Amino acid sequence: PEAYWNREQEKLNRQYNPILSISHLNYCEPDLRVTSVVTGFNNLPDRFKDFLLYLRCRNYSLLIDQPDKCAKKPFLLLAIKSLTPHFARRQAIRESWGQESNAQTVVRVFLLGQTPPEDNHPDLSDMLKFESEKHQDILMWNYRDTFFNLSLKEVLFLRWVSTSCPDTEFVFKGDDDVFVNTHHILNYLNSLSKTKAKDLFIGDVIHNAGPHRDKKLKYYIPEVVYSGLYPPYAGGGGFLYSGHLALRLYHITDQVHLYPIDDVYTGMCLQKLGLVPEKHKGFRTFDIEEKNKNNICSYVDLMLVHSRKPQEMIDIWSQLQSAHLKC
Ligand SMILES: *[C@@H]1O[C@H](CO)[C@@H](O[C@@H]2O[C@H](CO)[C@@H](O[C@@H]3O[C@H](CO[C@H]4O[C@H](CO)[C@@H](O)[C@H](O)[C@@H]4O)[C@@H](O)[C@H](O[C@H]4O[C@H](CO)[C@@H](O)[C@H](O)[C@@H]4O)[C@@H]3O)[C@H](O)[C@H]2NC(C)=O)[C@H](O)[C@H]1NC(C)=O
Ligand SMILES: CC(=O)N[C@@H]1[C@@H](O)[C@H](O[C@@H]2O[C@H](CO)[C@H](O)[C@H](O[C@@H]3O[C@H](CO)[C@@H](O)[C@H](O)[C@H]3NC(C)=O)[C@H]2O)[C@@H](CO)O[C@H]1O
Ligand SMILES: O=c1ccn([C@@H]2O[C@H](COP(=O)(O)OP(=O)(O)O)[C@@H](O)[C@H]2O)c(=O)[nH]1
Ligand SMILES: *[C@@H]1O[C@H](CO)[C@@H](O)[C@H](O)[C@H]1NC(C)=O
Ligand SMILES: [Cl-]
Ligand SMILES: [Cl-]
Ligand SMILES: [Mg+2]
Known part of the structure; x- marks a missing residue:
């Protein structure tokens, strides 16, 4: 069409589909051709300009791995998207609904990229190594x-x-x-x-x-x-x-x-x-009704609720353990 992503996606489609008759996965230099192709490129927010330039680079390597995470064959793998500074969120997840267990082995990893100092992020690297060495549940790419x-x-x-x-x-x-x-x-x-x-x-x-x-x-x-x-x-x-x-x-x-x-x-x-994808009513990505937020019995038949602060996750998981004795 005329939209850039729609345009480059059809090019991929013809590459992978014979009936429609530089790399797009390993090209990690700025694709400068986007600047003359996308209408009004210089007036776009920086996230768009960075996204368009390096759209074709996805060969990033792990800096922090836990290769023997699935040694014991897991029944459920919990992979949680996180950012470096979210220490309290990760720790509250470990202590509540994200703890590893067996009962059907359950394993937990947190997915991280880099928060580099050149983006004015505070250097939290040595606290992340400390966190990684102690909980062995951090996966970080570069x-x-x-x-x-x-x-x-x-x-x-x-x-x-x-x-x-x-x-x-x-x-x-x-x-x-x-x-x-x-x-x-x-x-x-x-x-x-x-x-x-x-x-x-x-x-x-x-x-x-x-x-x-x-x-x-x-x-x-x-x-x-x-x-x-x-x-x-x-x-x-x-x-x-x-x-x-x-x-x-x-x-x-x-x-x-x-x-x-x-x-x-x-x-x-x-x-x-x-x-x-199959809709399921237990997934409340838009929270629930405020009157039901008090009741721990409202969380028994739910799959997930968004959103929750760290101490909210711990309070709910704490109460949820005794919910079968009062719901
Ligand atoms: C998703 O994550 C990826 C991976 O981290 C990000 O990709 C990086 O993007 C940054 C931009 O934010 C890239 O860094 C930029 O590189 C430009 C090109 O430099 C190369 O080429 C020149 C020659 O043209 C060589 O001299 C040089 O050695 C490099 O090889 C630079 O022009 C950019 O300049 C920036 O910094 C300098 C110094 O402060 C200043 O001139 C400018 O102010 C400018 O800010 C910048 O250095 C980086 O190369 C990418 N890495 C990889 C591995 O691809 C994506 O940006 C990110 N996407 C989103 C949407 O967040
Ligand atoms: C019919 C219709 O138009 N429905 C609208 C919804 O699609 C829309 O949902 C939100 O849309 C966003 C993109 O437009 C995005 O998908 C968002 O989900 C969040 O997305 C980020 C990445 O973008 C993801 O990292 C994050 O996990 C996810 N968050 C949650 C809680 O799921 C999605 O909510 C909605 C806008 O609120 O409006 C509807 O009308
Ligand atoms: O640069 C980022 C920004 C977001 N996140 C994670 O992606 C999820 C979605 O973030 P956010 O809550 O800000 O988006 P929203 O839910 O409001 O749509 C959160 O778990 C964040 O920790 C991330 O991993 N890297
Ligand atoms: C991706 O591969 C290209 C070509 O092999 C290489 O030049 C580039 O450095 C790689 N990117 C990363 C992040 O290793
Ligand atoms: Cl632990
Ligand atoms: Cl918060
Ligand atoms: Mg959120």
Whole structure:
């Protein structure tokens, strides 16, 4: 078409689809041709200019790995998107719904990029090494951890699954400011037939959405960048899928250009597999009703709630342990 991403994506489609008859994965120099191709490139916000220049570079390497995380074969892998300074959020997740267990082994990793000093981030590196050496649940890549780079966090994670955790039955991928009912999730996982557990992918799916064009909102996308409607995509606050689908998802990522909104990007990859994400009412990416926020019995049949502060996650998980004695 005329939107840049839509244009470069069709070029990918013809590369991978014979019926339609520089690298797009390993080119890590600034693609300067975008400056004369995208209308009004110099008047775009810096995140767009960085996203367009390095759209074709995704070969980033792990700086902090936990290679023996899935030694014991996990039933559920919890992968949590996080930023370096979120020490309290990560620690509260460890102490509540993200703790490792066996009961069906559950493993936990936090996904991080770099918060480099050249972006005026405070040097928290030696506190992150301290945190890593003590909890051994930090995965960190050497890319600039930013909002528009989150679909990069998705691809680099799916790569780590295929190379360091391909056996895991299921994967939960979510944010570090949500409460997840890990107990209710595992009971849902064992109330599933092998037929459905094959290509399982559930979340707060959004249908027939389009790019926000409000120049001042977070998910704003210019019309020179993307045109049309998003595919169905689960809310990035947290979705649940099987390891089998994770491997299929990773191998299809090369056929989809990175997109600045990472949960939309996952939907584009699901669409390319011929799959539709499955809505589930337990995923409350928009919280619940304030009158029900007091009641611990309101959290028993939920899958996740967004959003929650660290001490809120701990308070709910604490109360949730005695919920079967009073609900
Ligand atoms: C997602 O994450 C990736 C990975 O971290 C980010 O990619 C990096 O993006 C930064 C820009 O923010 C890149 O750094 C920039 O490189 C430009 C080109 O420099 C190369 O080429 C010149 C010749 O043209 C060589 O001299 C040089 O050795 C480099 O090899 C620079 O022009 C940029 O200049 C910036 O800093 C200097 C010094 O302060 C000043 O001139 C400017 O003020 C300017 O700010 C800058 O250095 C970096 O190369 C990318 N890394 C990789 C591995 O690709 C993405 O930006 C990020 N995406 C989003 C959307 O966040
Ligand atoms: C029919 C329709 O138009 N529905 C709209 C929703 O699509 C829209 O949802 C929000 O959209 C954003 C992109 O436009 C984005 O997907 C957002 O999810 C968040 O996305 C970030 C990355 O962009 C991801 O990292 C994060 O995990 C995720 N957060 C949560 C809690 O899921 C999504 O909410 C909505 C705008 O609020 O409006 C609907 O009308
Ligand atoms: O540069 C970033 C910004 C966000 N996040 C994570 O991505 C999730 C979504 O962040 P945010 O809550 O700000 O987006 P929202 O939920 O409001 O859409 C959160 O868990 C953040 O920790 C990240 O990993 N890197
Ligand atoms: C990606 O690969 C290219 C070519 O092999 C290389 O020049 C570049 O440095 C790589 N990027 C990273 C981050 O290693
Ligand atoms: Cl621990
Ligand atoms: Cl907070
Ligand atoms: Mg959030």
